[PDB]
Design a protein around this ligand. Structure first.
Ligand SMILES: [Ca+2]
Ligand SMILES: [Ca+2]
Ligand SMILES: [Ca+2]
Ligand SMILES: [Ca+2]
Ligand SMILES: [Zn+2]
Length: 316
């Protein structure tokens, strides 16, 4: 909508207070004009018609319980935008400042979130398995990163290309969590997963097997569920990325870590320069080797560590 940019205040899913960029025109709208062509947050009103109605609020204060998922979806979309712009010089998910749109209160008791080809969508959870999923910054960045992937490498969402697609969203969801630097970890979804159970998460990059996901290519899932295991075999790439960043010895293979920034630079370059819709795990390894070479040199520690990491998870 046309109006004047304003700054509201509210509370997110976890009860924390934050300021949000809004737009005033009779009502205050969850419309952030400070980033690209705007960040827009919508109310799906517990239904499945998308996007729903642009979030309107009478007084620019968002402290109601119903407001909280909208506050976080809006705010964390902006953090994710800031990450891609400041760290990778990428303007929104299409590289040309496309509007970022999110709907919250999707359906009833919906234990998931997703990118639907055009926007982000967040359930409220059922209160047992999940609380409203936009409360997790890694979840929000995970979903927006799907939009980045769809505009760049375009990895098909099945089998190994789909597992790379998932891992890329876990990797950058995690790097965005670290970028904002609020209780960062190498776990996925811990902030919104199982409120009654401390210290768990949906997946682990540091130890995928903690939740049954493979941490080596020999353990890869080869059936047809989960579009051929895209959320399962992502553990193999997630472990590799974790090793590149943090180092470790995994099934006897030692990796010298090179830190998060260089992980992000290598995998962003791989994603945007070398990966294709049909890339498989071995092609990811080559893309990441070439990216590290471009950035740091064929004889660098960085290239050597990329190689050790993929060796450690059995990707040749
Ligand atoms: Ca209000
Ligand atoms: Ca965390
Ligand atoms: Ca996390
Ligand atoms: Ca939990
Ligand atoms: Zn995903």
């Amino acid at each position: 909508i046309t109006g004047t940019s304003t700054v509201g205040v509210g509370r997110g899913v976890l009860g924390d207070q934050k300021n949000i960029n809004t737009t005033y025109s009779t009502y205050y709208y969850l419309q952030d004009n400070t980033r690209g062509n705007g960040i827009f947050t919508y109310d799906a009103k517990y239904r499945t018609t998308l996007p729903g109605s642009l979030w309107a609020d009478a007084d620019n204060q968002f402290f109601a319980s119903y407001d909280a998922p909208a506050v976080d979806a809006h705010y964390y979309a902006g953090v994710t935008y800031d990450y891609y712009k400041n760290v990778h010089n990428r303007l929104s998910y299409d590289g040309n400042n496309a509007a970022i749109r999110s709907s919250v209160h999707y359906s009833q008791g919906y234990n998931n979130a997703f990118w639907n080809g055009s926007q982000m969508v967040y359930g409220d959870g059922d209160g047992q398995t999940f609380i409203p999923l936009s409360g997790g910054i890694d979840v929000v960045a995970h979903e927006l990163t799907h939009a980045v992937t769809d505009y760049t490498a375009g990895l098909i969402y099945q089998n190994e290309s789909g597992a790379i697609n998932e891992a890329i969203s876990d990797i950058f969801g995690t790097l965005v969590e670290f970028y904002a630097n609020k209780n960062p970890d190498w776990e996925i979804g811990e902030d919104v997963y199982t409120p009654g159970i401390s210290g768990d998460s949906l997946r682990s990059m540091s130890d995928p097997a903690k939740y049954g996901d493979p941490d080596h290519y020999s353990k890869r899932y080869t059936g047809t569920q989960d579009n051929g295991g895209v959320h399962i075999n992502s553990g193999i790439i997630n472990k590799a990325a974790y090793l590149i960043s943090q180092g470790g010895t995994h099934y006897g293979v030692s990796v010298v870590g090179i830190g998060r920034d260089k992980l992000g630079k290598i995998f962003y370059r791989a994603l945007t320069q070398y990966l294709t819709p049909t890339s498989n795990f071995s092609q990811l390894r080559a893309a990441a080797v070439q990216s590290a070479t471009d950035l740091y040199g064929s004889t660098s520690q960085e290239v050597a560590s990329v190689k050790q990491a993929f060796d450690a998870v059995g990707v040749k």
